[PDB]
Amino acid sequence: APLNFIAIGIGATLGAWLRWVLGLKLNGAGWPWGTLTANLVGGYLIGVMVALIASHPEWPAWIRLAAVTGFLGGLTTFSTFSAETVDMLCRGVYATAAAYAGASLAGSLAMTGLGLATVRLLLR
Amino acid sequence: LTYAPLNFIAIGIGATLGAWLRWVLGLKLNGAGWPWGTLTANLVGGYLIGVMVALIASHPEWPAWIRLAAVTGFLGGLTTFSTFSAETVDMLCRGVYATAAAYAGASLAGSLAMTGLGLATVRLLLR
Amino acid sequence: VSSVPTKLEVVAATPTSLLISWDAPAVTVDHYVITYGETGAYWSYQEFTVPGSKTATISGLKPGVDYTITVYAYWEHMYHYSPISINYRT
Amino acid sequence: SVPTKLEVVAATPTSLLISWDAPAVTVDHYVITYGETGAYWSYQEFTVPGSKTATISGLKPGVDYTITVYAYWEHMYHYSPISINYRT
Ligand SMILES: [Hg+2]
Ligand SMILES: [Hg+2]
């Protein structure tokens, strides 16, 4: 449907902007905070969002599409992350790369757990 | 200039295009058991960003809007860590740790690889 | 936070195999994920996907072992209604 | 071929002073990357902005180090680096 392409595009654009802004304010090549920040904040909120959308499967399409598929899809990035990690590898700093990759991976997974948990907690 | 109105537009456009493509891919290819549409987008994205980075170092002269729209927009919206994370956790929660590990390794090693091949593709085709 | 694939039945022919069937009218289900493993020992868990049909078959089980089968009813990717599980020994 | 030239001006056997001159183009920051030429797991790194001189510490004396300066103009994009092999 055409509403949906719009729902996504809006969220995607908002998230993408926020990520980019974060990336200006926080992000060096040595250790990319702005990226990780966005990826983790994103990881958290998607845990929340998923818990809310299972518990209310009645809600209309545009919400999940705009929140999750749009906003959180644009707020977060694997592309940038990958390029930054490879950058580190290429620089020779394998420790750092591993660190950034573990941070980014473990972190996001954790966040998503705490985001799920925060909702399961606050509906009991 | 780094905070200009053309730039917010450049990003928003690419971000929206990427996000759409990802979502379409995610309809056409992806189940909860193993999310291809996601991985496809994340890997295709991983590849192209390798390309894009090699082209933008080799031509640092180009104008801002290109990198912002291609990379920060399109490849930022085409790819997702959020979705990926949620899908992996989903697996973990299901109890299928093998699968989860697989999907996480795929998604991680894959994207890294792709980015290497994307860089390599450009270094190769500019000898 | 409520019950799904309502009505879940398990025939257990063979100590290596198992036949699940359910009846899950409204709500809609996009697909089910069947998840089965030796209770607890989580790396052993395997899984397969069935669409909006209503019967599955599991093979290659270890005999005399405590298995746990779960049916997760997903309506549109990453979202699923509360599952039903069955514990049984082969 | 960026931060051009690039050289080492300092002593102690545990420390080292790099300096360069990198007018046009524009650099957002430099990343200095150093380790014992051989073992790649030893390599460490730090970041300096658009200034033009750095200082490395906590080196093992009499050891073959390899310093690289990467000149980044915009987060993930950098002009080709310069390296130096130096014994402390
Ligand atoms: Hg590099
Ligand atoms: Hg689940």
Side-chain angles (χ1 to χ4, degrees):
Chain A
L3 170 71
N4 299 334
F5 282 120
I6 296 158
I8 292 165
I10 286 160
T13 300
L14 282 159
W17 283 345
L18 168 50
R19 156 163 55 74
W20 171 61
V21 160
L22 274 156
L24 307 165
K25 291 193 197 291
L26 300 166
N27 237 23
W31 222 78
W33 283 104
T35 302
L36 186 61
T37 305
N39 281 330
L40 291 167
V41 167
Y44 178 80
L45 299 172
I46 192 155
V48 166
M49 280 316 295
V50 161
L52 301 173
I53 299 163
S55 63
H56 302 99
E58 297 215 49
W59 299 355
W62 73 268
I63 288 169
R64 104 175 112 270
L65 291 171
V68 183
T69 280
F71 182 74
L72 294 174
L75 176 60
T76 63
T77 160
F78 223 110
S79 76
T80 298
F81 158 77
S82 199
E84 288 161 333
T85 304
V86 170
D87 197 18
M88 282 163 206
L89 292 159
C90 143
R91 257 139 58 214
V93 298
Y94 300 145
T96 307
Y100 183 54
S104 275
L105 193 79
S108 204
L109 285 149
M111 284 318 97
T112 298
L114 304 172
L116 287 152
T118 59
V119 168
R120 297 159 186 206
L121 165 58
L122 307 172
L123 290 180
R124 256 181 200 175
Chain B
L1 208 79
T2 310
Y3 230 94
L6 171 71
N7 299 335
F8 277 71
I9 296 157
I11 292 166
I13 286 160
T16 299
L17 283 159
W20 283 344
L21 168 50
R22 156 162 56 75
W23 171 62
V24 161
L25 273 156
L27 307 164
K28 291 193 197 292
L29 299 166
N30 113 9
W34 186 271
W36 282 104
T38 303
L39 187 60
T40 305
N42 280 331
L43 291 167
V44 167
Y47 179 81
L48 298 173
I49 192 154
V51 166
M52 279 315 180
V53 161
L55 301 172
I56 299 163
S58 62
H59 302 98
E61 61 240 24
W62 297 355
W65 73 267
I66 289 169
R67 105 175 112 272
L68 291 171
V71 183
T72 279
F74 183 75
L75 294 174
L78 176 61
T79 63
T80 160
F81 223 111
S82 75
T83 298
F84 157 76
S85 200
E87 287 161 332
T88 304
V89 170
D90 196 19
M91 282 162 206
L92 290 159
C93 141
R94 257 139 58 213
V96 299
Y97 294 158
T99 307
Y103 183 55
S107 274
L108 192 80
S111 203
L112 286 149
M114 283 317 98
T115 297
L117 304 171
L119 286 152
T121 292
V122 167
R123 296 160 185 206
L124 178 256
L125 307 172
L126 291 181
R127 273 199 130 277
Chain C
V1 202
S2 18
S3 33
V4 174
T6 330
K7 207 166 217 211
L8 182 88
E9 169 198 308
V10 135
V11 191
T14 331
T16 3
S17 18
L18 178 86
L19 176 100
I20 320 113
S21 74
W22 56 90
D23 282 0
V27 212
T28 332
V29 87
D30 195 91
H31 57 271
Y32 303 97
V33 156
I34 281 82
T35 271
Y36 65 100
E38 291 163 53
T39 311
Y42 272 122
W43 285 94
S44 74
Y45 277 48
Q46 308 159 100
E47 191 181 69
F48 61 88
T49 321
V50 172
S53 70
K54 59 196 218 155
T55 315
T57 214
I58 295 168
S59 319
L61 301 185
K62 297 169 165 191
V65 174
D66 279 321
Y67 275 96
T68 309
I69 299 91
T70 318
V71 180
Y72 299 95
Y74 285 83
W75 59 269
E76 240 217 25
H77 197 23
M78 328 171 70
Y79 320 100
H80 78 298
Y81 320 99
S82 322
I84 277 199
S85 274
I86 297 185
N87 294 256
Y88 104 104
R89 191 169 222 164
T90 43
Chain D
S1 40
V2 171
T4 59
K5 301 152 216 211
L6 179 93
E7 83 217 350
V8 158
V9 201
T12 326
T14 40
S15 17
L16 281 181
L17 178 100
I18 318 114
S19 76
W20 54 90
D21 15 13
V25 214
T26 322
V27 88
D28 195 271
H29 58 273
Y30 303 96
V31 156
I32 283 82
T33 272
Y34 66 99
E36 288 163 54
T37 309
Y40 259 69
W41 273 273
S42 74
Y43 276 51
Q44 308 159 101
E45 191 183 70
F46 62 87
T47 320
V48 172
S51 69
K52 61 188 215 156
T53 313
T55 216
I56 295 170
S57 319
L59 301 184
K60 295 169 165 191
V63 173
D64 279 320
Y65 277 96
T66 309
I67 299 94
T68 318
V69 180
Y70 301 92
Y72 285 83
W73 56 270
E74 169 72 22
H75 197 311
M76 318 170 254
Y77 319 99
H78 79 297
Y79 321 98
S80 278
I82 277 199
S83 278
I84 296 185
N85 295 256
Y86 189 105
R87 191 168 226 164
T88 41

